[PDB]
């Protein structure tokens, strides 16, 4: 009597939608305390079988495998937000879950999803309109305010105690990978700002080198290790007789070609190295193999040779030393011999030798010296560094700032609550609803402490009404009503605007689910 494959399972109704909202909860409850300057650390077991300790949304969730694929959907939006602007992922997740909770209070009374979505559209419209109406600028012309924003960002992070320190370690690294080509398109490539971490050392040892630091070593004892102005060239050819791509097996008939062939290969190496010796070099690095005949030749001329280097490191060194990578030693030009490095440095940071290319002119690609006590520690510091560079870049492309810690978000809740009553229509109830949902933001911040949330909430809600005192938030370490104009907490507008749009839209899209099927290919 059957019709389709027996593996079919179709379900629908309000019950599965409610199950989806409870899944949203069961995600939202996992992260409810890692928010704000006062945070409570969280550890996770890596799905591959490792260990990880983080306190930001996606980094927590990106290492989480789930069933009931809606949880996968929120993991997807978490990764999207993280790679999108790079902060407040926990904020987006908790907002989405709680405001879905609020919307469920509205769906259950026979109401249709469509009117809810229309209210969602009007709500986000008003949110962005008033945010632009409230977004204020700031001049990007100082160390003061930039380091203040860095402090305000990483106060929610563990490196808050070294904030100013980290500030500088961030700031320098930004200014010396910043590059611009062809009279336009200034670029800040974090990949060129390569991160490296070294065992041992103190936390304060962290710094960005005005040059390039690499994990290699010289390739012969004779080649000296100290050069003040390196005549470096960027080789992209293997040091051996070229094979090419043609077929093989020339036919040997006589006794005067074999050793002749060996000698002609030796002389080919001779010429290939001679065209390099000509330009008076100091050091040479290559991405491929090196022949002993060639190293002997460069030894005769006192030149320094380096074996294979990573292509990303190759490009970074090309940016640093001002040389142009060439794969044609026999077509070498005087145009692109590297010059601009402050010192050749061959040291042993630890027990593995490193090469430290200190530079003397404006570089475009760094290696960051990092010192700590465990790979976990250095990894956490790494994540803090990406947060720092991303937020600094956002400020570089946004002269505007909006206070964090819960002030402007209460303010916009109030503003849109006022805006709701102007029109006439039941749609104001779902619309205004999201603002009520918005009121979740400070709760956790207080709930991270355990203070009397009700009085603080009512006080802030009132204060944001008279004389538009829309600048007051909570001092997280104290959990006390304060004005953000003095505490010094500010975040780039990009992160929170992204939070707005992403949370509202995922709320829009998670409502459209009513019917589900499983068991198919």
């Amino acid at each position: 009597v059957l019709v389709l494959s027996q593996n079919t399972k179709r379900e629908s109704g309000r019950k599965v939608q409610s199950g989806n909202i409870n899944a949203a909860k069961t995600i939202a409850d996992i992260i409810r305390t890692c928010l704000g300057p006062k945070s409570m650390m969280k550890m996770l077991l890596d799905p591959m079988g490792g260990i990880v300790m983080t306190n930001d949304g996606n980094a927590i969730l990106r290492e989480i495998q789930v069933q009931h694929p809606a949880a996968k959907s929120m993991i997807e939006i978490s990764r999207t937000q993280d790679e999108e602007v790079g902060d407040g992922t926990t904020s987006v997740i908790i907002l989405a879950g709680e405001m879905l909770s609020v919307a469920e209070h509205f769906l259950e009374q026979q109401m249709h999803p469509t009117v809810v979505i229309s209210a969602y559209r009007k709500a986000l419209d008003d949110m962005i309109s008033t945010l632009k109406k409230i977004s204020i600028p700031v001049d990007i012309s100082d160390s003061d305010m930039m380091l203040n924003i860095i402090n305000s960002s990483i106060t929610t992070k563990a490196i808050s105690r070294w904030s100013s320190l980290a500030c500088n370690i961030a700031l320098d690294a930004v200014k010396m990978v910043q590059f611009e080509e062809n009279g336009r398109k200034e670029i800040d490539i974090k990949k060129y700002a390569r991160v490296e971490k070294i065992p041992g050392g103190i936390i304060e040892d962290s710094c960005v080198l005005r040059g390039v630091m690499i994990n290699k070593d010289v390739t012969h004892p004779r080649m000296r290790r100290y050069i003040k102005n390196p005549r470096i060239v960027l080789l992209d050819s293997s040091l051996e007789y070229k094979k090419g791509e043609s077929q093989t097996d020339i036919e040997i008939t006589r006794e005067e070609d074999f050793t002749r062939i060996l000698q002609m290969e030796e002389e080919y190496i001779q010429q290939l190295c001679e065209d390099i010796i000509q330009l008076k070099p100091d050091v040479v690095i290559t991405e491929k193999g090196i022949s002993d005949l060639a190293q002997h030749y460069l030894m005769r001329a006192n030149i320094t040779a380096i074996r294979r280097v990573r292509k990303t490191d190759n490009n970074r060194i090309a940016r640093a030393c001002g040389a142009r990578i060439v794969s044609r030693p026999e077509e070498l030009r005087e145009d692109d011999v590297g010059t601009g490095a402050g010192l050749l440095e061959i040291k042993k940071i630890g027990d593995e030798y490193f090469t430290f290319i200190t530079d003397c002119k404006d570089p475009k690609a760094c290696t960051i010296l990092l010192r700590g006590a465990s790979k976990e520690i250095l990894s956490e510091v790494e994540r803090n560094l990406q947060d720092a560079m991303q937020v600094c870049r956002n400020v570089l492309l946004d002269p505007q700032l909006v206070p964090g810690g819960g002030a402007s978000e209460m303010a916009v809740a109030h503003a849109l609550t006022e805006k709701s009553k102007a029109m006439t229509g039941v749609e104001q109830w779902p619309y205004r609803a999201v603002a009520q949902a918005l009121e979740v933001i400070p709760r956790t911040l207080i709930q991270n402490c355990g203070a009397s949330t009700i009085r603080l909430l009512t006080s802030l809600r009132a204060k944001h009404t008279q004389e538009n005192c829309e600048t007051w938030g909570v001092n997280g370490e104290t959990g006390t009503l304060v004005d953000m104009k003095e505490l010094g907490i500010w975040e780039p507008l990009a992160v929170k605007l992204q939070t707005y749009k992403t949370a509202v839209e995922t709320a829009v899209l998670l409502l459209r689910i009513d019917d589900i099927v499983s068991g198919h290919k």
Binding site: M48, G49, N215, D217, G289, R307, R308, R310, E352
Partner: protein, 354 residues
């Protein structure tokens, strides 16, 4: 990294996985951004640089390796010990050449690799027993005792299933309708994979297929015809056993196996007598096992006993062996790592001692 450059494939998963996640054919995300589309299609263009059991090219292998686990496997090998496969036999030159490239472009902490025969033996669940490595193009004998392959005990024989098919089509001209074209080579191989069994022997099989003609199987195929009296089927295995069929008159493979076992001390041969498992590559049909059993029993003293072992599926056997060895929990004692690579280079790999 449980990547394994097999006979023609590379299979990438993890040690704990039940299988590799990706294959190596030598538009998942290809409609979102296309970043990896170009890289993967370019790597796809590059060919397989391994033939006859010896490495033949080197730039392409690293070219493929870079992409294959930097764009889908999503792994940093700097934080991982490495476990690949290799061609069945090579001198130390290729090993110490591959070490250089691996380190100089990846700098991975540690390494260990092993001969495919060892991986197959592990997959079958044995640490002992010589396996008949009847690989494509060429076959080899690898007597394994406790796991390590003896450098003094590997024999190589040039027989191949390609050669068997060619010799069949060299005596299929005597069958009337010969077969030589690509389609005809394919149909000869298809019939071979359908029926080329062994009962006991040549003349007695031919008698029962011609005198009584009761070994006939009519071929009702779009690409085939009823042209086999039961002769050609059995005519594939016979040259597999008796060299003079092919015109290259030499000793039998059984002779090579027997000598490669006898040159060692008799006691250890007992353990080699224990399993004596086989491997495919040119053999897929039954009748092989008991026939070679009795054939070498003629060469085996009646005072001692011999066993024949042949699993039906051995397709990921090297991968199974690799996964097992990755969890052996003692193989790290034999890892060759940076502590020796940066100290001695390739000299220790050469076994300067002894």
């Amino acid at each position: 990294l449980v990547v394994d450059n097999g006979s023609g494939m590379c299979k990438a998963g993890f040690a704990g996985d039940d299988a590799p996640r990706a294959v190596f054919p030598s538009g998942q995300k290809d409609s979102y951004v296309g970043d990896e589309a170009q890289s993967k299609r370019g790597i796809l263009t590059l060919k397989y640089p391994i033939e006859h059991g010896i490495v033949t090219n080197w730039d392409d292998m690293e070219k493929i390796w870079h992409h294959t686990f930097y764009n889908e496997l999503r792994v940093a090998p700097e934080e991982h010990p490495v476990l690949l496969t290799e061609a069945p036999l090579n001198p130390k030159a290729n090993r110490e050449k591959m070490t250089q490239i691996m380190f100089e472009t990846f700098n991975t902490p540690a390494m260990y690799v092993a001969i495919q025969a060892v991986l197959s033996l592990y997959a079958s669940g044995r640490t002992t027993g010589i396996v008949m490595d009847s690989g494509d193009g060429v076959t080899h004998t690898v007597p394994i005792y406790e796991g390590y392959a003896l450098p003094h005990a590997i024999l190589r024989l040039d027989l191949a299933g390609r050669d068997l098919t060619d010799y069949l089509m060299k005596i299929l001209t005597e069958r009337g309708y010969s077969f030589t074209t690509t389609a005809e080579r394919e149909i000869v191989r298809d019939i071979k994979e359908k029926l080329c069994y062994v009962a006991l022997d040549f003349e007695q099989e031919m008698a029962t297929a011609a005198s009584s003609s009761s070994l006939e199987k009519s071929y009702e195929l779009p690409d085939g015809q009823v042209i086999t009296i039961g002769n050609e089927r059995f005519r594939c295995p016979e040259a597999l056993f008796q060299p003079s069929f092919l015109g290259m008159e030499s000793c039998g493979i059984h002779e090579t196996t027997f000598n490669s076992i006898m040159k060692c001390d008799v006691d250890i041969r007992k353990d080699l007598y224990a399993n004596t498992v086989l491997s495919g590559g040119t053999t897929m049909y039954p009748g092989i096992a008991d026939r070679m059993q009795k054939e070498i029993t003629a060469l085996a003293p009646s005072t001692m006993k011999i066993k024949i072992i042949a699993p039906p599926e051995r397709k990921y056997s090297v991968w199974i062996g690799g996964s097992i060895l990755a969890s052996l929990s003692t193989f790290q004692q034999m890892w060759i790592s940076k502590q020796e690579y940066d100290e001695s280079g390739p000299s220790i790999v050469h076994r300067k001692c002894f």
